[PDB]
């Protein structure tokens with residue numbers, strides 16, 4: 296038959312027994328009209344579910360103030376919680392383990408997305424400069440955010456708490472805290488953004504307090520063994536760079552050891568390495584960013600991660616695990632339909648072997 300490979304090796308993560316190490320990375324596909332999950336997602340996540348395979352759903356918005364893009368799903372209303380259920384059940388029907396990624400864009404937004412035209416919230420009052428959207432035809436503008444006050448922050452921390460609870464109500468096996476790519480949590484961590492003079496700014500310790508308070512609220516709420524967190528210390532997305540990525544990364548992983556989480560998901564830098572973080576972190580380490588079958592196997596073998604998440608390739612190959620397991624050809628992915636809004640085209644029309 297076929298020789299076993301590292302990527303197909305079983306794994307015990309948190310309270311779960313995974314059958315392989317190919318993880319579906321969190322992917323924003325903007326096909327959730329009205330911020331409500333849709334029927335087509337049922338088929339999407341179902342095509343990608345395998346027994347004991349881990350799936351991390353697209354970034355899900357925690358509150359009205361956390362919206363920065365059209366058609367991204369939310370999880371703060373009963374209507375949204377009910378819409379997720381059939382999707383969750385379809386993943387479970389094939390034996391997959393599903394984590395809901397909870398998110399808040401912070402300053403990466405515009406007043407037109409905000410309730411009452413309010414300004415976006417962030418750790419700073421500095422806004423982003425315009426960016427070109429995915430289609431290379433439209434320019435995205437951002438409103439300057441308002442700098443949250445010290446005693447207002449705990450309420451925001453609470454929003455992640457409720458979201459986490461709601462995901463559990465929807466049936467998710469757990470939640471991944473979105474602490475990467477320049478969004479609210481990352482905005483607080485990165486020194487090029489956090490210009491605060493209170494206990495949530497300045498030192499590396501204060502800048503991580505927000506994220507850590509969030510990890511604490513969520514773990515207490517749903518149990519730490521049902522909680523993961525994603526970070527990208529080295530990423531510069533949305534003008535969120537840090538002058539010492541390595542220490543920032545080491546600080547976070549070391550600080551996360553006391554929480555007994557289900558896992559730490561770190562994004563590879565696009566020198567800088569995740570090795571140190573992997574070494575300092577005592578739990579399950581998930582890595583992502585530019586992997587293929589070869590690099591995946593090598594990362595597992597060289598002890599660089601316990602799980603490897605795939606994004607783009609999982610978009611175009613519904614059966615990525617199977618293809619790696621047979622070292623079969625892979626469908627090419629079309630970035631033109633990554634963020635387009637059709638219910639089928641570029642979302643579920645990618646073929647199986």
Ligand SMILES: Cc1cc2nc3c(=O)[nH]c(=O)nc-3n(C[C@H](O)[C@H](O)[C@H](O)COP(=O)(O)O)c2cc1C
Nearest residue numbers: 320321322323353354583584585586605606607633
């Ligand atoms: C279309 C698209 C949407 C994404 N959406 C998210 C998201 O919602 N949350 C997140 O944390 N990362 C998101 N990412 C980043 C990916 O999860 C992952 O880190 C990235 O795909 C790196 O791996 P790859 O080389 O296998 O594509 C997205 C990437 C792409 C291409």
